[PDB]
Design a protein around this ligand. Structure first.
Ligand SMILES: CCCCCCCCCCCCC/C=C/[C@H](O)[C@H](N)CO
Ligand SMILES: CCCCCCCCCCCCC/C=C/[C@H](O)[C@H](N)CO
Lengths: 277, 56, 278, 278, 277, 85
């Protein structure tokens, strides 16, 4: 036994599976070759509780008007693809009434259902790692730290691509001020092979055609500014390169469908019009 | 402090209709502004203020 | 933190149940144990994960700052009679990496100050024991411009007066984040640039916000100057206490380059080894 | 000090009750809450006003005096072998402002003495560890004229003997005001001039009374002088304890000028900003 | 839990609304355009309790003889007025038997009912802040600290005026030794806008014609010398300048009526005759 | 789509002003056109948007055969629909 007694007031001073259907609003997704679906950290998206509400004004919950699947621009997977990234809610800023509520309010909160679709025949090869990264900070391309500008950090539904090797932006007069995400460094100075600590799913073309990730709202705050802060980052990397019948030049589309969930907005004002690239 | 990540917002005042006066009345008036905290207000991490300083 | 499960004896198996075969596409780690693939004996486990707890992992004092101050004379322009240090854990790598294992953290802090002083020359006499003032300056508070200006009254600023030769000074701080947790990473900006305004306006550094603004420490030697110069260094050791962490991340694999996630050098961290070389 | 009230959910309202409209002419502050003017959710408040208490606000050691003494020789007329300091919080601004937030106060006091010494020259030898005598001299008690006169017997005067290198000395004092509270402000005189007597007689300083007369501290180095001069400084830190305060006042907005409320300089404290500039 | 044990004797060593009628004596005040009435600090004036009586000799309580409304000299409010101040009990030193008891006794105590009256038409503009300040110390006009003389510090029922800007008295031979209260500094080096921390009322000419403040006896002592110490200070400032129909040169009277309340006097002697200005 | 409405008309004037406004909610507020062709008002004019339209003191006939206005001609005293206001 030992005896412990606190001699101070403040406690700081104390000693230390395959067939699935997803319906949101007026949108429905059917899948037959699914590898199940992952709920990030086992937490389903939810609305702010009265015990955690910071803003006092009544929130607006568009529900089905905004809690529905929006499909982003399709990308092409080739043998030379290094990977793609999107930022949420940034990727949905021009998507129906969700983007309208996003830009008309000072504070916004939403979870997501991300559905990545990549169908290929039984004679194709390749694997895609689909990772949901909270606070997916990406490295810049200049000797100046944290120098990436807002326009490039928020590409929108197109997102960005990973790079095979790091290139330094030496243009002093007109710096690019863009990201330089290196695929094997995961764009953030960490080995990509460890990226599986994040919620993820692998689309192995021999097994499944799609991946589904249910992202809860993750943040150090109950609600934040959606225009300032991207809660999530979706990163897709080719773990196994695409291959097909030795024909070469094969390319298959990857489509991304994101549904915001449990959307809450506070602080209605005039609409925000961010500066464009 | 003036801080971007913890910025507070913007207060503004506008004319809804306008100020209307009859004749023989001052056409210019004054409003006075007051501020206070609510009962849910709180502070923490006591520090030294920058509103008082001493010389030599 | 608690005890591990025991190992149960396993005999030969001949069945249609195949724990070995799985599908990692689901994103789920197979929770197999040795008894599933090989015959095992019974082992009464006595090992524990007590030292792997998040509290134990961070329960060390880590140097985060070396603040240099001088006691020479007001006339000397090359001697810094006081030093201001922005409070951060990113001036050092080891604690920064251990912390950036996680996206969010929430903890009390323990600051320990180890002060070491020395002479710089010999033929100018000797000095008496020095008293150091370490004044915490929260954001918005006036910042000293001289080593002996009014700011050091500390009527409201917390201040530590350390006598040289005494054991290293120590204070504890509660969780003082304006958010509900400390953000190791902030994927955003403090400003949103608005259409119309000049490119000069609205431009904010990526990943920088006021979540990590904690004020600074101003360190001075309270004593008047002796006829000889004395150089002192305060080493700040930060120990998280009552640690909670959220959203684990892969650790930093390449050298840090600035306060953000930028990398510029040492991008080839892995050595060369044969595929079939043991 | 205790927990704040929770926030109750508020829906749309359409009624003849108008909490927003008020009349400040009454001198009463409208006690509105967010749910009165906007629709609010339910928030279970967990913030507290524990650090805003009057005790916390004053629970810091604030420097109030830097007393300089010397140990050189009786012959040297330029060295002050003892120093007398009238006890007051008005030699420094920060604590003075924090206190003058209120008209009246009543508290115990904690005095901490941080002593730092140094050499003044090199080619005269070295010194042995010094003992300092800090003698409290209440009003009316004899005041030392020499560093080694009979007054330092301290048969009745409380006295602190501090060994250099020991932790800063410390004493506590009860509330020692002859009134029921300390008067931060006294709108009056000690004398009333009477009709008939000469203008020289009856003239008293405005705001000065014996309420703030607390005696002085006489500080000396008990040691005899070494062949070399040693200069020491005692820093006095005052911490109010068990604080009660009455009649809050607006804080000092312009620089202090003397012991009273006089101002002479820095009368333009506010900067320039546009009316419609955010 | 933590354990605390005291190792010393002395505890110091331990660790840390519109229509109103006011009748006092033979005086009565009726108001129809009142903005209610403020009781300073919510404490009504009262007599010394036996549990707090410092002097031992029997007090004298003139009651109605002195506890009655006395009207001071009227001042004029113009567009150029900066404000006025009075000191209590100094403003009542020549008012009936109250002043007699004040000067015949060494110790005096009294609360007050201050009634400020300023009537103007419905075509006038302006607001007056009326502030009751305990220990209303005012700044002097010389480089010498605390150099204001008794005669100027106690003007009487006329009181003094605030100044737009600070002026320094450089007359070395015959110094004025007068106050220099700057209106925006409230005469004491504090911004006037914060003066509302004191008990106060605003006379807005569109709303009310009068202000009423019930000041309890406030002091660090239960009873003091009224000739030495002014318990209260009444400061009136134009918050909104006076204006009327663009005619200009308009001026309206402000009248001050103060009733001492619960007067107690101790230490009867020969009368005090203070030196005059 | 389906929705009810709360219409709030605001018109403040001093105590020395005169005038009255009738504010009418009309279901199926059909308005008369300005041409000899029946029911000839085009979609663009029938749906002005938030600006709406104005009533007219007297009926005017659109005789421009080449480029007909194809706009409404609501007469104020006929309420724009052949009925006394
Ligand atoms: C007594 C005066 C000097 C010592 C007092 C300094 C107090 C400063 C404590 C608050 C600021 C630091 C709080 C924690 C630091 C970082 O946020 C954490 N490492 C975040 O992970
Ligand atoms: C042991 C000898 C030296 C130390 C003893 C000195 C004792 C002096 C304590 C009594 C006088 C100071 C009491 C409080 C000071 C001021 O009145 C307060 N700051 C008023 O707000």
């Amino acid at each position: 036994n030992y005896t412990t007694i606190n001699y101070y007031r403040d406690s700081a001073s104390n000693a230390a599976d395959r067939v699935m259907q997803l319906t949101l609003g007026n949108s429905t997704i059917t899948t037959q070759e699914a590898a199940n679906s992952v709920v990030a950290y086992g937490r389903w998206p939810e609305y702010i509780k009265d015990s955690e509400a910071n803003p006092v004004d009544q929130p607006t919950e568009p529900a089905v008007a905004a809690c529905r699947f929006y499909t982003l621009d399709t990308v092409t997977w080739r043998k030379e693809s290094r990977g793609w990234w999107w930022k949420l809610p940034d990727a949905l800023k021009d998507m129906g009434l969700f983007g309208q509520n996003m830009f008309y309010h000072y504070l916004g909160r939403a979870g997501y259902t991300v559905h990545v679709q990549c169908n290929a025949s039984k004679f194709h090869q390749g694997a895609l790692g689909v990772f949901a990264v909270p606070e997916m900070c990406l490295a810049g391309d200049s000797t100046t730290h944290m120098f990436t500008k807002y326009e490039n950090a928020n590409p929108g539904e197109k997102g960005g691509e990973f790079k095979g090797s790091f290139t330094l932006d030496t243009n002093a007069t007109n710096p690019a001020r863009n990201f330089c995400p290196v695929d094997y460094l995961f764009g953030s100075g960490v080995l990509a092979g460890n990226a599986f600590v994040y919620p993820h799913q692998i689309i192995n073309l021999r097994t499944n055609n799609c991946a589904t990730l249910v992202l809860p709202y993750v943040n150090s705050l109950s609600i934040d500014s959606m225009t300032k802060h991207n809660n999530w980052g979706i990163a897709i990397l080719p773990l196994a390169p695409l291959d097909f019948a030795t024909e070469s030049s094969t390319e298959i589309p990857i489509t991304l469908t994101i549904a915001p969930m449990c959307c809450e907005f506070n602080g209605l004002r005039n609409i925000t019009v961010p500066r464009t690239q | 402090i003036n801080d971007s990540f913890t910025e507070g917002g913007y207060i503004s005042m506008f004319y809804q209709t306008r100020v209307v006066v009859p004749l023989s009345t001052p056409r210019k008036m004054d409003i006075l502004g007051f501020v206070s905290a609510c009962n849910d207000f709180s502070v923490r991490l006591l520090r030294d203020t920058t509103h008082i300083s001493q010389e030599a | 933190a608690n005890n591990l499960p025991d190992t149960q004896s396993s005999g030969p198996a001949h069945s249609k149940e195949t724990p070995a075969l799985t599908a990692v596409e689901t994103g789920a780690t197979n929770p197999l144990v040795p008894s599933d693939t090989v015959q095992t004996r019974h082992v009464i486990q006595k090992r524990t994960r007590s030292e792997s707890t998040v509290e134990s992992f961070f329960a060390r004092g880590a140097c985060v700052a070396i603040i240099e101050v001088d006691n020479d004379a007001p006339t000397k322009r090359a001697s810094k009679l006081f030093s201001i240090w922005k409070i951060t854990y990113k001036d050092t790598v080891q604690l920064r990496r251990k912390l950036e294992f996680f996206t969010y953290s929430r903890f009390d802090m323990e600051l320990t100050f180890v002060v070491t002083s020395n002479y710089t020359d010999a033929n100018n006499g000797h000095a008496l024991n020095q008293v150091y003032q370490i004044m915490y300056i929260p954001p918005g508070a006036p910042i000293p411009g001289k080593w002996n200006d009014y700011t050091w009254q500390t009527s409201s600023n917390p201040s530590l007066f350390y006598t040289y030769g005494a054991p290293p000074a120590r204070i504890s701080v509660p969780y003082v984040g304006i958010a509900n947790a400390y953000s190791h990473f902030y994927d955003g900006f403090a400003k949103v640039p608005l259409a119309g305004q000049a490119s000069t306006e609205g431009d904010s550094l990526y990943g920088a916000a006021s979540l990590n603004d904690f004020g600074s420490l101003a360190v001075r030697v309270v004593n008047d100057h002796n006829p000889t110069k004395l150089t002192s260094k305060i080493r700040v050791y930060m120990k998280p206490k009552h640690v909670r962490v959220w959203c684990p991340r892969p650790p930093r694999a390449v050298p840090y380059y600035g306060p953000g996630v930028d990398y510029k050098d040492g991008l080839a961290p892995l050595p060369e080894k044969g595929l079939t070389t043991y």
